[PDB]
C-alpha cells in the first residue's frame, strides 16, 4: 500500500467528487451531441474546437482515473473490477485519440469503430447516480429470464425464414408479376369483349422495390434477407403493402398459402411471442425491484 | 421384451446421449440455414454438398431412432407417444428423401410441401432441453383459454368483412374516384373562376393499388379479401393511407360512414379484443408457471 | 296464462333446443359469409339461392321466436327483456325482407342500412353459449370504467385538433412546398455555384396526397379531418412519412414547432393515454372475472 | 375580510354553481370545436359570430372569476393557488382578446401562440369533476417515477443519434445510391452477358425522399434530425422501408452494420425501454389508486 493512498482513496469516494465526475461525463456527452449537431460535416467548420475539446476531456478523465487507481494501488482486480476496466478502455481510447491528434496517424484507417467508443462514455454516468444504476442492473439481471423465450422466437423466425426463402425467393423475378382481375363477374366489362380482346382479366404489375431489387430477391432472396424481413414483419412495419400483399395476390387461386403464412407468422410470433417475452422481462425486473 | 432391450433403453435416456442428439438436431438446423443462405438458388452451385449432408443427417437420425425404439420393443404406444410419432414422421420424410436421392423420383412433383418438413426438425430439440419444453407446453396449455376470445374476435372480424364487402366492393371501380376540394371557401381560388371554368372543386384521383387492382376489388372485393384486409387493419399496418382514407374521402358529405366503420373496428377489435386475448393468454401461461 | 304455455316454456329452455337454435344462428352466419364470398356482386349469379335461403332462415327464426313468446304469454317485459327485444328487431327485419321478396318494394331505397342488420344476427349466439356471454358481459361492465380516461383522451385529441387546424390547414396550399438543402456546408456543391446559379439550396416538392388533396387540406383542413388524422397518429399509422415529416421540414429553422407538436402528442396520447385506458379496461374485466 | 365575503364564498362552492361553470367550460370547448370545424378558414364566413361568442364567454368567465376571488378577498395565495393562477392566466388572455376586439391591435403579431391558450380552457373542467381530477393527479404523481427510465431512454437515443449522424449523414448524397444484384447466381442472366455488357449486377436507385432531401441529409443529416428519426423508429413508424432498408442494402457486403444498428436499437429502446417505462408509469398510477 502506498503511503498517501488511503487519503486519496476516500477522497475519490466523496459525494462531491462523484457529482463533479458525473457533471464532467454529462458535459462530454453534450459536447459530442453539439459536435454532431452544429458541425458533423466532412468539411468541419470549427475543427480544432472539437479536437481540443476532446483533448481536454480525455486529459481530465486521465487525471481522474489516475486518482481513482492510486487509491487502489493500481490493482483494480479486487475493487469494482468491471467498472474500472470499462473506465480503463474508454480512457485508453481517449489517449489513443490524443496521441493521434498530437503525433500523426499511428493507426490504420480500419479502426474508426474503435474511435467511435467516445459516444459510450455516458455509460460511466450510470455508476454515478443510484437510480439509473438500479434500472440498468435490473435489466441485466432480467435478460437471462428473457433468453429462453427469445431463443424460441428466433427458432420460429428461422423456420419461417427457411420457408419464405424456399417459396418466394423466385417471386416477381422477371421484375413484373401478373395479378388477375375479376371484371366480367363484377360487370365492369362484358364477357364478350374480354374474349374479343378489348379488355383483359390479367394486368401485369411491376415487382421492383424501392431498393431496386425484385420482391423475392430483396425480401426473401437469401436466408438472412428473409430473417430481416420477418423481423420487419414482427415489429409490424409495412408487412402488408410491401411484404405480404404482392405475394398474397401473386397466387391466382392458391392465395391461402401466403395468407396463412403471414397470418400464422404474425399471430404466433408477434402477438404470442412478443407479449410473452415482454411479460417475462417485466416480471423479472419487478421481482428484482422488491 | 427383447433380451438386450433394457440396456439400450437406459442408454438412450443418458444425458450425454440426449445432448449429442440435441447437438445433431441443432447442426441439422444450421445446415438447412446455411443451405438457404449461401446456396438457395434454383441453379445450385454446391449441389451434392447439401444432398449428401441431408443423406448423412437422415441416416444418423434413422440409427438413433432405431436405438430409441429398440429399447421400447418397437411399440411406441405406451411411452411418449406424441414425440415418438413426430420423430417417426420426420425420419419417414428423411428416408423418403434419401430414397429419392438414390433411386430417382418415385413421387409426383405435387408433394414438395411434405419434403419441406425438414425445416421443422428443430422442434425435436424442444424435448431435449427442459426450459424450452416448459415454455412450449405452457403455450399449448394456454391456447384453450385463448380460444373463446379468439372466436369472438373472428366473429366480429367476419361481421365487419360482410359489411365491408357490401359497402366498398364497388369503390373506385372505374379505376379513378373523385374527391371534392373546398378551394373557394379557403380562398385559394375565387368563386367566379370555379363557375367560369378556370378552376374546379373536384379533382379525380386513381384508385388502382400497388397490386394492379382497384381499391374495392382488392381490399374488399370478396369476403376473404375483406377478412384479410381487416386482419391487416387489426395488426395496424397501413390501415389509413391505403385502406381507410380513400374510402373516407370518397364520401363527399357522408364521410361519417367510413370514419365510424374503421374507427369502431379499430377500437373494438384491435384495442379491446387484442389486449383481452393477450391478457388471457399470458394469464394462463403464468398460472401454469406456478 | 295460456293453458299450454308452461309446457312450451320449459320446452324452449331445453338445452337441446338451445343448441339447435345456436346451430341455426351459426348456419345463418355462414350462409351470409358464403353469400358475400362466392357471390357478392351487383349482378348476382345465384340470386334466388340467397333470396330463398334468407326466406327460410327468417321463417324458422319466426317460428322459434313465436315458440319463445308463447311460453311467456307474448309479454316479454318481465323475462329477459333486452335479449327478447333484440330478437324481436332481427326477426322484424327478417319479416320485412321476406315481405319485400314476396310483394315488391314496399320501402324507400334509403333504408338499406336497416336491411343490413342480418349480419348482426350472430350476436344472438352469445346468449346460447355461456363463455361468450361471460366475456361480452364483462366487456359491457368494464366500459364505464373506461369512460373517464376515454373522455380525457378525446378532450386532448380535440385540443390538438384545434391546434393542428390553426397551424397546418394552410400548409402546402399551392400544392408544392419548399424544403431547404444544406449542400454547400456538406460539400456536395461549392458555395460559388450556388450564388452563381448552377445549384440551389432550395427544392420545391409537391404537397399533394394520394387522395388528391394538399397536405393541409386533407390532414388538417377542418376540425373533423384533423381529429381523424390525430386518431390515425394515435393508432400509429404512417404518422411520420405522411403526416409529420412534411410539416416538420416545412419549417426552415422553426422545426421545433412540428417536432414538439407530434412528439408530445404521440407521447402523451398514444403511450400514456392508450396504455392507461387499456389498463383500466383489463383491470375492470378481471375484477369482474372473480 | 370583506363584510359579504363568506356568503359569496360558500355560494361559489355550491355544487350547482360548480356544475354550471363546468357546463360553461364544456360549452366554450364545443364552441371552439365548432369554430374550427365549420369555419376555420382565413376568410371566415361567420366572423362576428365567433368573435362575439368568445367575447361573451370571456365576460362570463370574468364575472365568475370575480365571484371566486371576492370570497377569498382577492388573495389566492392560501386557497387553491395553482388552479386559481391557471384560471387567472386564461381569463387574462380572454380579457386581452376582448380588448383587442374592442380597441384595435394593441399587441405585436408575434404572440398568436399566447392567444392560442383558449383551447386549453377545458383543463378547468378537470377540477369540476372528481374522477378526471383523480386521473390527472395520478398521472402527475406517476411522472416522477417515469423520469429515470425516460432519461435512460433519451441517453441511449442520443447515443444512437450520434452514431447515426457519424455513419449515414453522407448516405445517398449524390441523390442516387447503388445496390448490387446477384442475377448470375440466380439464373436470371448468364455470366457471359454481364461481363459482355448486356446485363449488370448493379442498379442505381434514387435516394431522394418525399421531402426532397437525400436519405442521409433528412434522416441523419444533423443530430436533431437523427434524434427525430430515432423517435420515429422507436414508435415503429416506417423504420424499414424508409429508414433502415436503404442503409442496409447500401452496404454491399458490410450489411451487418446497418442491420445490427437498427435491430439492436429497436430491441433495446423500443421493446425493453418502452415496456419498462410504461410498466413503471402504470405501476405508480395503480399504487396511487389504492
Amino acid at each position: 500500500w502506498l503511503p498517501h493512498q488511503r487519503k486519496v482513496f476516500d477522497f475519490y469516494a466523496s459525494q462531491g467528487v462523484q457529482y463533479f465526475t458525473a457533471f464532467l461525463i454529462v458535459s462530454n456527452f453534450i459536447f459530442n451531441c453539439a459536435e454532431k449537431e452544429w458541425d458533423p460535416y466532412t468539411d468541419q467548420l470549427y475543427q480544432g474546437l472539437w479536437r481540443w475539446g476532446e483533448f481536454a476531456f480525455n486529459t481530465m478523465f486521465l487525471i481522474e482515473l489516475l486518482i481513482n487507481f492510486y487509491g487502489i494501488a493500481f490493482c483494480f482486480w479486487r475493487y469494482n473490477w468491471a467498472w474500472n476496466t470499462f473506465d480503463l478502455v474508454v480512457v485508453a481510447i481517449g489517449t489513443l485519440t490524443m496521441a493521434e491528434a498530437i503525433g500523426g496517424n499511428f493507426m490504420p484507417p480500419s479502426m474508426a469503430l474503435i474511435r467511435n467508443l467516445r459516444a459510450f462514455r455516458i455509460f460511466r454516468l450510470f455508476k454515478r447516480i443510484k437510480s439509473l444504476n438500479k434500472i440498468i442492473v435490473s435489466l441485466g439481471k432480467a435478460i437471462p429470464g428473457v433468453a429462453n423465450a427469445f431463443v424460441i422466437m428466433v427458432i420460429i423466425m428461422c423456420i419461417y425464414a427457411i420457408l419464405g426463402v424456399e417459396f418466394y425467393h423466385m417471386t416477381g423475378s422477371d421484375g413484373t408479376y401478373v395479378t388477375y382481375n375479376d371484371n366480367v363477374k363484377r360487370g365492369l366489362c362484358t364477357g364478350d369483349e374480354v374474349e374479343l380482346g378489348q379488355c383483359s382479366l390479367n394486368q401485369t404489375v411491376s415487382s421492383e422495390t424501392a431498393r431496386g431489387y425484385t420482391y423475392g430477391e430483396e425480401y426473401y432472396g437469401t436466408f438472412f434477407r428473409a430473417l430481416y424481413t420477418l423481423f420487419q414483419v414482427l415489429t409490424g412495419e409495412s408487412w402488408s403493402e410491401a411484404v405480404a400483399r404482392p405475394a398474397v395476390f401473386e397466387s391466382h387461386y392458391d392465395s391461402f398459402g401466403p395468407v396463412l403464412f403471414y397470418v400464422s407468422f404474425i399471430i404466433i410470433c408477434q402477438i404470442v411471442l412478443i407479449n410473452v417475452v415482454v411479460a417475462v422481462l417485466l416480471d423479472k425486473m419487478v421481482e428484482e425491484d422488491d | 421384451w427383447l433380451p438386450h432391450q433394457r440396456k439400450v433403453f437406459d442408454f438412450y435416456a443418458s444425458q450425454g446421449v440426449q445432448y449429442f442428439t440435441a447437438f445433431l438436431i441443432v447442426s441439422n438446423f444450421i445446415f438447412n440455414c446455411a443451405e438457404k443462405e449461401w446456396d438457395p438458388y434454383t441453379d445450385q452451385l454446391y449441389q451434392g454438398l447439401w444432398r449428401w449432408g441431408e443423406f448423412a443427417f437422415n441416416t444418423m437420425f434413422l440409427i438413433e431412432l432405431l436405438i430409441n425404439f429398440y429399447g421400447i420393443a418397437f411399440c411406441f404406444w405406451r411411452y411418449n407417444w406424441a414425440w415418438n410419432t413426430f420423430d417417426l414422421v420426420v425420419v419417414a420424410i428423411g428416408t423418403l428423401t434419401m430414397a429419392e436421392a438414390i433411386g430417382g423420383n418415385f413421387m409426383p412433383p405435387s408433394m414438395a410441401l411434405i419434403r419441406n418438413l425438414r425445416a421443422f426438425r428443430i422442434f425435436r430439440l424442444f424435448k431435449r432441453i427442459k426450459s424450452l419444453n416448459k415454455i412450449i407446453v405452457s403455450l399449448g396449455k394456454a391456447i384453450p383459454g385463448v380460444a373463446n376470445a379468439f372466436v369472438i374476435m373472428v366473429i366480429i372480424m367476419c361481421i365487419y368483412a360482410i359489411l365491408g364487402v357490401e359497402f366498398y366492393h364497388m369503390t373506385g371501380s372505374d379505376g379513378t374516384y373523385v374527391t371534392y376540394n373546398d378551394n373557394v371557401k379557403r380562398g385559394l381560388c375565387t368563386g367566379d373562376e370555379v363557375e367560369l371554368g378556370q378552376c374546379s372543386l373536384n379533382q379525380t384521383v386513381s384508385s388502382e393499388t400497388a397490386r394492379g387492382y382497384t381499391y374495392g376489388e382488392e381490399y374488399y372485393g370478396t369476403f376473404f379479401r375483406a377478412l384479410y384486409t381487416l386482419f391487416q387493419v387489426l395488426t395496424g399496418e397501413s390501415w389509413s393511407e391505403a385502406v381507410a382514407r380513400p374510402a373516407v374521402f370518397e364520401s363527399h358529405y357522408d364521410s361519417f360512414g367510413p370514419v365510424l366503420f374503421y374507427v369502431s373496428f379499430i377500437i373494438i377489435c384491435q384495442i379491446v379484443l387484442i389486449n383481452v386475448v393477450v391478457a388471457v393468454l399470458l394469464d394462463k401461461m403464468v398460472e401454469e408457471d406456478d | 296464462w295460456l293453458p299450454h304455455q308452461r309446457k312450451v316454456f320449459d320446452f324452449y329452455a331445453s338445452q337441446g333446443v338451445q343448441y339447435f337454435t345456436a346451430f341455426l344462428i351459426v348456419s345463418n352466419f355462414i350462409f351470409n359469409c358464403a353469400e358475400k364470398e362466392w357471390d357478392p356482386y351487383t349482378d348476382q349469379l345465384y340470386q334466388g339461392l340467397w333470396r330463398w335461403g334468407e326466406f327460410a332462415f327468417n321463417t324458422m327464426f319466426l317460428i322459434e321466436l313465436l315458440i319463445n313468446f308463447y311460453g311467456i304469454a307474448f309479454c316479454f317485459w318481465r323475462y329477459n327483456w333486452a335479449w327478447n327485444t333484440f330478437d324481436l328487431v332481427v326477426v322484424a327485419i327478417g319479416t320485412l325482407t321476406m315481405a319485400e321478396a314476396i310483394g315488391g318494394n314496399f320501402m324507400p331505397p334509403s333504408m338499406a342500412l336497416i336491411r343490413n342488420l342480418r349480419a348482426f344476427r350472430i350476436f344472438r349466439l352469445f346468449k346460447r353459449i355461456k363463455s361468450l356471454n361471460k366475456i361480452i358481459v364483462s366487456l359491457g361492465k368494464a366500459i364505464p370504467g373506461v369512460a373517464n380516461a376515454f373522455v380525457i383522451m378525446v378532450i386532448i385529441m380535440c385540443i390538438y385538433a384545434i391546434l393542428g387546424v390553426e397551424f397546418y390547414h394552410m400548409t402546402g396550399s399551392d400544392g408544392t412546398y419548399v424544403t431547404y438543402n444544406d449542400n454547400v456546408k456538406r460539400g456536395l456543391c461549392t458555395g460559388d455555384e450556388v450564388e452563381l446559379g448552377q445549384c440551389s439550396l432550395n427544392q420545391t416538392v409537391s404537397s399533394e396526397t394520394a387522395r388528391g388533396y394538399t397536405y393541409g387540406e386533407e390532414y388538417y383542413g377542418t376540425f373533423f379531418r384533423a381529429l381523424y388524422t390525430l386518431f390515425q397518429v394515435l393508432t400509429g399509422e404512417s404518422w411520420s412519412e405522411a403526416v409529420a415529416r412534411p410539416a416538420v421540414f416545412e419549417s426552415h429553422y422553426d422545426s421545433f414547432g412540428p417536432v414538439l407538436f407530434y412528439v408530445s402528442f404521440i407521447i402523451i396520447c398514444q403511450i400514456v393515454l392508450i396504455n392507461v385506458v387499456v389498463a383500466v379496461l383489463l383491470d375492470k374485466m378481471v375484477e369482474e372475472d372473480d | 375580510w370583506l363584510p359579504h365575503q363568506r356568503k359569496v364564498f360558500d355560494f361559489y362552492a355550491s355544487q350547482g354553481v360548480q356544475y354550471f361553470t363546468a357546463f360553461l367550460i364544456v360549452s366554450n370547448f364545443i364552441f371552439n370545436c365548432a369554430e374550427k370545424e365549420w369555419d376555420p378558414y382565413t376568410d371566415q364566413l361567420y366572423q362576428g359570430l365567433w368573435r362575439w361568442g368568445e367575447f361573451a364567454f370571456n365576460t362570463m368567465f370574468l364575472i365568475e372569476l370575480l365571484i371566486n376571488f371576492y370570497g377569498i378577498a382577492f388573495c389566492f395565495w392560501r386557497y387553491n393557488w395553482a388552479w386559481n393562477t391557471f384560471d387567472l392566466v386564461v381569463v387574462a388572455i380572454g380579457t386581452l382578446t376582448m380588448a383587442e376586439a374592442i380597441g384595435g391591435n394593441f399587441m405585436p403579431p408575434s404572440m398568436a401562440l399566447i392567444r392560442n391558450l383558449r383551447a386549453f380552457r377545458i383543463f378547468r373542467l378537470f377540477k369540476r369533476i372528481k374522477s378526471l381530477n383523480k386521473i390527472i393527479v395520478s398521472l402527475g404523481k406517476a411522472i416522477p417515477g417515469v423520469a429515470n427510465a425516460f432519461v435512460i431512454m433519451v441517453i441511449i437515443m442520443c447515443i444512437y443519434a450520434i452514431l447515426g449522424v457519424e455513419f449515414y449523414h453522407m448516405t445517398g448524397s449524390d441523390g442516387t445510391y447503388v445496390t448490387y444484384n446477384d442475377n448470375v447466381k440466380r439464373g436470371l442472366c448468364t455470366g457471359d452477358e454481364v461481363e459482355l455488357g448486356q446485363c449488370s449486377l448493379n442498379q442505381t436507385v434514387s435516394s431522394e425522399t418525399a421531402r426532397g432531401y437525400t436519405y442521409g441529409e433528412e434522416y441523419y443529416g444533423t443530430f436533431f434530425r437523427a434524434l427525430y428519426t430515432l423517435f420515429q423508429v422507436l414508435t415503429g413508424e416506417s423504420w424499414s422501408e424508409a429508414v433502415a432498408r436503404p442503409a442496409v442494402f447500401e452496404s454491399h457486403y458490410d450489411s451487418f452494420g446497418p442491420v445490427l444498428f437498427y435491430v439492436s436499437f429497436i430491441i433495446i429502446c423500443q421493446i425493453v425501454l418502452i415496456n419498462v417505462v410504461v410498466a413503471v408509469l402504470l405501476d405508480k398510477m395503480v399504487e396511487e389508486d389504492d
Binding site: N275, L282 | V278 | N275, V278 | D283
Partner: peptide
Amino acid sequence: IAAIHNARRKKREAAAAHKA
C-alpha cells in the same frame, strides 16, 4: 399488453401477499 397485463399482476400478488 404485457406491460398492461404485468401491471395488473403486480396487484394480484400484492393482494395475494396481503392475505397470506
